[PDB]
Design a binder for this molecule. Sequence first.
Ligand SMILES: CCn1c(-c2nonc2N)nc2c(C#CC(C)(C)O)nc(OC[C@H](N)Cc3ccccc3)cc21
Lengths: 344, 18
Amino acid sequence: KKGSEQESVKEFLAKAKEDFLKKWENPAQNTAHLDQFERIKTLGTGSFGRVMLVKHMETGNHYAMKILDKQKVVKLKQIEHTLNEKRILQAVNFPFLVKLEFSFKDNSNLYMVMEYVPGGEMFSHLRRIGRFSEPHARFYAAQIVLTFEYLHSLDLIYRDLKPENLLIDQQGYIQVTDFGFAKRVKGRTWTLCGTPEYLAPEIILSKGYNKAVDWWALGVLIYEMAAGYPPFFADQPIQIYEKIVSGKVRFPSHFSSDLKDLLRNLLQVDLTKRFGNLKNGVNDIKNHKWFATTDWIAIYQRKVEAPFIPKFKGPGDTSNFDDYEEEEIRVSINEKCGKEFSEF
Amino acid sequence: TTYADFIASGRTGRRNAI
Ligand SMILES: CCn1c(-c2nonc2N)nc2c(C#CC(C)(C)O)nc(OC[C@H](N)Cc3ccccc3)cc21
């Protein structure tokens, strides 16, 4: 019954903000060049670029490299989002976040070089195994709660929580990736973005939202991890939004009473009643019965034994990732979108 | 069963926002 460990957490978060604000004020630019990396294989694809496995040639270290087509970023209206992503990544520091190692740009593309996590996405493991046990789901949930506590204290909203964006490392721990929709927000923001299944009601209703949408998404994530499917799904997105805003959620019979109670409070359509967004804040989540067995400090310190460790086949193995057809990276003779990506 | 409905909808694969 001691809470001087909250005084220490308060002090921790104060130091974290100091370090963040220094890097936020004086960000890093052009810390590398494309010819220093050996392109090996595509790990993922997107509407305005692709992610590749890469090898830092002088050192031999494997990294992931996100390649963004500047013209396509402009076209798809992701300019501000791309700038947010880089500026936030270079300023943040937390155990369960993927680290940005280098960033640079050329005539055609933007480049972000980051930690490679060969264990792959939680998504693939969840879809294969079917669903996770509640202790297994709780292990991952606890890491996301501490990560959101860290990010939110720096006034950052993540806005893209889902199994696809949670990588599993060699120790079985979470590495949160894809900061594409991350934004620094004191007060409200208005962009309609994220994945339909994971969208909070506020976002759908186009009214203005805050940090609370992250806590909603945590509920969706915990549900999907434990159930094997998300709480709101349908053939098309519009029918998914109807379900989200309705205030109706059905739980599998195997869900414990504690889990159902936590999720009722996280999947609270009224934002003044949603866990994480009340006066006690994140401690409502942390002190909940479902997390009664969670040693929060041991999790942060990575001292808890992981329930699942992915099969290690080397630092450059890509067997946990799907295969994609390989297009050559063409850099134009002329600079594209020089003004739009000036601060990158 | 709900799980069967989830499989029946072709949205079991990786989902992209954009
Ligand atoms: C292949 C899986 N993957 C990894 C990764 N797998 O192993 N180690 C890793 N770090 N990192 C990823 C990132 C990231 C990131 C930063 C820069 C840290 O914010 N974004 C992803 O997707 C973004 C977007 N959702 C679709 C996309 C993709 C490309 C262009 C345009 C859009 C996928 C990622």
